């Protein structure tokens, strides 16, 4: 039984410092109700309650662990999501216009593409690739094939969907309009990043793949308050959580 | 085997002491017939037995747990349901022309707004929260996504009907036209009580969640003729009935 | 193994004396030749044959026991069924231009109004009540809810198509015509009887209540010859066949 | 395994010396070569031998068993169906002209009409019988209901098809253009034998009932020569063949 | 793990001293390399590779069994398939232009018509019998109607089939232009063998009956290169091979 | 778990000594990944990477071993694949433009026409065949009939897709355009070629058949980078892995 003091320190702890907003603050107290009234396990209120932080702590996760090959550290998480130095950080006004699955774009494309610490990296693979390879890479990579067939969604509709000429036209749109880049190279460049990120949020909010599972474990190892690995130089989401 | 003598006093001390009516004592008597033919089970017919007095008596308990944190006491039930001193009450003719679904508004509004004892933390809770969101709150918190999962109900549809336009629009009509408010907030937290009125209506007739089970249970309690806990600050339903 | 001498006699018996027509002789004959040729146990064979019996003995112990709350004994079943100081019984003339269910409705309509046992206790219980609410009272009274759905039959149907408007029009023209009543308190109370009488007949002809099982052991009690029980003041079917 | 010459011998007992005709030769030549190819058991090929004297052997011993209440005996079998005093019987030139149906109705109203041996009974006990009563019962007591529903074969729809007007006023054609009656009650009482005449047929075709399993064995008792029973007056199917 | 080397022989064994075409060579060498790859059993390679000499071999086992009564010996078959003293034999330039239906027809009619062995007992018992009546018991003599619909497949619509008065009009026109016979019994004989012939080829095609596993075992036994049998007055195939 | 490092050089001993492409990189980034979060086996990420090289390897090991009889020897590999002597080899830009099927065709025309090793065995045997004959011929040789039905697929309709005479046209336009060939005899053995080319691509791709099987565990054998066989004369797929 999770009383709604309990759960809204979890979810503080997971929002790193950030208090609930008064509609989330409903639906932390209504799982507590449900544990309370036999209704709902202690584990799966929690999870649920975990579930609520995906567009303000799981998308400094998992970008960066892909492009960067590592998750940010519990300073560096607390810098980027919620922090007084930090005066444009994810749970601000600065980011109060986005939603998840743009987000989950921005960070992509700041870390590929510009100063970004993965930027060198990414250009060097993932030059002279087409924008079908390159969704059908990603979707392997994060989600995986096998894994997204066992669970019983479409592998071929959903990677064809992924990379239809719609998706493209608005990404691509989305890059010229807003980043500080004109040539063919650099636009070509940062759309890649703009799908995998797409792909990024689409894993997270599904719960299909090793990097939502990944991420979710951290996540639920922020919650009680102190990370167990908090490593200085990042935590290694794949070998921290196997 | 029940006789019908033995239904109607159970059904009386479960209607605080009002007899039965004319209609329902025909009701009663085919239960306890089926009793003795071997064609129904004596816990399913008291348990239907029970279940004719919603409008009159789970009115009283379920909303009072809701709002103001607790059930009323025997004394309270008696005052509110059937009393000498209150002239206006659920089983006289004051509210002899409403049916189950708008009594239960009733007693949500008067208690969230104006005199009502869950009146301030009603305010202080829901505000800044849209329709639909109180809805999905409620929802979750009254009945439960997983319990109504698993008993077969539609939890999407059911919380989109709840919160049509259609709703919302006869709602707010009910309010303004009845209750002495005018002001846009006023009138928005009102509608918030009838929303959450009518899901509890909801659960009660279905017979779906902790509310649903944790006011048939107190009603069993109080069918024998006394409470067992009769608490005097009143009676927590998920605490005394596990 | 039954032979055609047998089975006529135990139907004169469940008859009261009453020899079998020549076209019902053939269809006893038929009984007798099934169980001779291994196609039909001792047992059904029996109760098929005592299920000719329905519209001259079946009527008269459910009627009273409906509405007087006791069923007739030996004697009082031999003037009603067949009796020689009785000009006027079911087997005769007077009733020969009936059929099953108009046989249930004429003794309904006679002990529920006028000089009937039961027509004082029909009056007090059966007044204020809706012609709706008493079809749904005596159908769950007869045959049962619970014991209706798990035969198969659905009970929401059932209920509608016996509460039509049709039927109500159809039984109002024939307690007018026919009883001499013309006040609307008299012919509302009639049709009430008659409602319940069609229902009784319904029971009967599907099998399926307590009512058609309880007559059913007393006229297999009956069929030997000398009733068991032959209680004088009459037999209660519910306590003398549980 | 059954050579050709066993089969005939068979055939030739059960049709009582008549030698099978050159197409019914080549089928019996069909199923001894099934025997030894190992394609059909010794038991089936026999029953299916037997199976093709329905129309000569069969049409005797059913008819008297219906009508008369006892099949007719070895010397009486003989006489009908192949004798040498008897210039028309069952499988000469006099009955060459018929078919099975056809010959099952001609048996059935020489019993019940004119001086049939059972035709005093045929008359009293089958007076005042509408049509479709007749056929009802007549169904029953050879086949069975309970025995045709358990077979698969649809009861109500059987019946419905045998009782249908189009079968009335053929068979009343039949009787009139053929037998020597012109008054209605005699028409209408040789019209009820045709009507049993029909059932007869229909069930010794398919195989279920009672009649036809009774007369099955007797045939497969007369296969091997010499009749087990051969009572003098008569062998009761139903008890010497249980 | 069969060579082809090895298939062929047992091919030419079967077929009598012929060597395999080019066509079917690849088809026997597609045999071998299925076994080598472990794609098909040994005794599976066996029966196929003695499924290519149904055209040549085994017309000549099943016409003779059928209507001569006895299966050709080693020297029989190896005069009517292949040998050197016969010009016109079954895997030559005359029978070039048949097809292995048309084959089944020739030895049919050759045999129960004009000079053929069984041509006098053909006569005898297939005279006055009709079309129907003829491919009805051929069909139950040679594939049997209770093995075939076991099999699945339809017995009554694959008699009606080979019945069909397109079939016989093909047929008849077949002997009258082919055979010289001009009468109509020497025709409607004809006719009946030709019937036959189809329902033969029919058996062999599909491979269900007890003469298309017999035939199959005798091609079995000759493929080793010696019948174990041999018989000098020919080998019956039903007690050869039960 | 395999690291990225140990799959691009799993792959390179596959593809004989050539680095793997930029967008094949990706995929087998991609298959590392999987392995590490525990989205796939170590033994079907190996398969799947060993996969990529069928254009490239499976080609030369497949081709040599239908036609010549014979599979390529670790050197004879190195020089089709990839080797420095040979400026137009199976990955370089001579080989570009061709697709898997293309790739296929080439090599079997090679060696069936012209100078080819098996161009003298291969006018021997497929000599007088039909195309629809070589194609059911191959298709069982290659893949069988047995094993496709059973994996799911329909033979029927796969031999006549792949004899349709779309196919034909268009491979014969493929012949004449390209091979020095303009007789009608040396096209038609040409075709057959290009047809049985296809059939093998068809086996690879879906990975049916013996020789899909075979050649996988050859390049597996490969894959650690000495073959373990490396027989001189070449080596025989059949024997050395069964
Ligand atoms: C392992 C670990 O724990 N490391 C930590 C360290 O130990 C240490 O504690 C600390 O570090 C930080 C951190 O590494 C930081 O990393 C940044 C950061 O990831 C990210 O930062 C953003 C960037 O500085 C910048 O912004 C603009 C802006 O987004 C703009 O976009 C427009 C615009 O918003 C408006 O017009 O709306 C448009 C729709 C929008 N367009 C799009 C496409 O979205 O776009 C431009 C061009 O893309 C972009 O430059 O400002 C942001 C406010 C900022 N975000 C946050 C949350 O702060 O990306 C940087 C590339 C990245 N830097 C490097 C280097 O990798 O870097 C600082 C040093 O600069 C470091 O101290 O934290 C570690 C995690
Ligand atoms: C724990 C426990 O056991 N406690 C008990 C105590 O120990 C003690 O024994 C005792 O207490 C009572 C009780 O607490 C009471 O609580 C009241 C009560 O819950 C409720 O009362 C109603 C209210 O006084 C009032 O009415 C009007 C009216 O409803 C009107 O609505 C109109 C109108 O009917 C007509 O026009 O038709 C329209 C359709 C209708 N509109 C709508 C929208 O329905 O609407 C106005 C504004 O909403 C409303 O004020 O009169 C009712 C007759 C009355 N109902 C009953 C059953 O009596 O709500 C009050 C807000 C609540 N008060 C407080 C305070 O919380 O309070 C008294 C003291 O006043 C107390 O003694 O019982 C405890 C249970
Ligand atoms: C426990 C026990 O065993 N008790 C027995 C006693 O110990 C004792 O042995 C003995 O008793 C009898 C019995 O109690 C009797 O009960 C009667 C009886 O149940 C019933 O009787 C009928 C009534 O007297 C009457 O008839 C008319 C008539 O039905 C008429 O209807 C018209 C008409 O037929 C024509 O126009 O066609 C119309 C279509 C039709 N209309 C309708 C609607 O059908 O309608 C009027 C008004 O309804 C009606 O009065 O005459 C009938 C012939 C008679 N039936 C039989 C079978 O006899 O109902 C009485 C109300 C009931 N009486 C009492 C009192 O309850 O009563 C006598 C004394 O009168 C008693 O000796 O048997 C016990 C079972
Ligand atoms: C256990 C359960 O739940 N059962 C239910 C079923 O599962 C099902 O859901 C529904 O099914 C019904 C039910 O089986 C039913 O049966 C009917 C019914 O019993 C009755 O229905 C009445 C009838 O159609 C009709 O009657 C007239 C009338 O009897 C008339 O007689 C006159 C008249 O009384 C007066 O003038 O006096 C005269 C002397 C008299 N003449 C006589 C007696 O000769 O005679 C005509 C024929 O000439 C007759 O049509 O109309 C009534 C309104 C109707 N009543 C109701 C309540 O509907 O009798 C039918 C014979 C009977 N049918 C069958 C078949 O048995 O059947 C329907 C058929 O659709 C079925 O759907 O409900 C169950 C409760
Ligand atoms: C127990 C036992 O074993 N008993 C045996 C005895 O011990 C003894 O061995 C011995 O007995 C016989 C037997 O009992 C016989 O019984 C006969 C017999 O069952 C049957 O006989 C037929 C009857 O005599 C008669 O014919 C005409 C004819 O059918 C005609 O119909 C016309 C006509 O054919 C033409 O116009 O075509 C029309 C389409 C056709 N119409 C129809 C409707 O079909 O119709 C008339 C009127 O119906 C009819 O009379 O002649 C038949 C040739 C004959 N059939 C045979 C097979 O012989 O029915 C008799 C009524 C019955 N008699 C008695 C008595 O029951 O009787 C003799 C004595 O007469 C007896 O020796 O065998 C016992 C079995
Ligand atoms: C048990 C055993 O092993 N026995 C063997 C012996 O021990 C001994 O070793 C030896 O015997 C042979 C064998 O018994 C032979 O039997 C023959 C044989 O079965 C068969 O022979 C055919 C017949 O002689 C004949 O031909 C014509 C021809 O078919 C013609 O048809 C035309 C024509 O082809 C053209 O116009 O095209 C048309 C489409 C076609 N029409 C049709 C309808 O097809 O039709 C006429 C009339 O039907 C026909 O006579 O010539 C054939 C070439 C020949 N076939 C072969 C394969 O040789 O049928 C004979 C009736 C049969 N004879 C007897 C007798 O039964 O007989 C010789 C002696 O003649 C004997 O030495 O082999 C035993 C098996
Ligand atoms: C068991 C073992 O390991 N053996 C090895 C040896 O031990 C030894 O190590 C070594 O041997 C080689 C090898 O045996 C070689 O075999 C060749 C080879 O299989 C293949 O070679 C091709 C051929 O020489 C040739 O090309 C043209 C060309 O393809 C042309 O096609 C046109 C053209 O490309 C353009 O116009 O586009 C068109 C679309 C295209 N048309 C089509 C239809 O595709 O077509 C003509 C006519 O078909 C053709 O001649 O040149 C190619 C570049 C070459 N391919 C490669 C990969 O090198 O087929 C030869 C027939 C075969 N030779 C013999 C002999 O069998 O032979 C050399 C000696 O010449 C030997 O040293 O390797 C062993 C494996
Ligand atoms: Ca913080
Ligand atoms: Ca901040
Ligand atoms: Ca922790
Ligand atoms: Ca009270
Ligand atoms: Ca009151
Ligand atoms: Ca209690
Ligand atoms: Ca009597
Ligand atoms: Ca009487
Ligand atoms: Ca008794
Ligand atoms: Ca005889
Ligand atoms: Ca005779
Ligand atoms: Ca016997
Ligand atoms: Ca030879
Ligand atoms: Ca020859
Ligand atoms: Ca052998
Ligand atoms: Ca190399
Ligand atoms: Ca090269
Ligand atoms: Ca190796």
Redesign the interface.
Known sequence: AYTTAQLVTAYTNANLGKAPD??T???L???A??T?????SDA?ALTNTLKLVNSTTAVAIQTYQFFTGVAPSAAGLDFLVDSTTNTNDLNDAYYSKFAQENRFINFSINLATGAGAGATAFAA??????YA??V???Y??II?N??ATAAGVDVAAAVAFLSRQANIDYLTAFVRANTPFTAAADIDLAVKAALIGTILNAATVSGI???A??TAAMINDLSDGALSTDNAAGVNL?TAY?
Chains 1, 2, 3, 4, 5, 6 share one sequence.
């Open positions: 008064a509609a603050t409903l639906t107290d209504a799982y109700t449900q309370q009234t036999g209704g709902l799966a693979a993932y030059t002279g690739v087409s390879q390159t059908a890479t990603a392997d990579k995986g096998a894994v793949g090793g990097y599972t990944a794949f196997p």
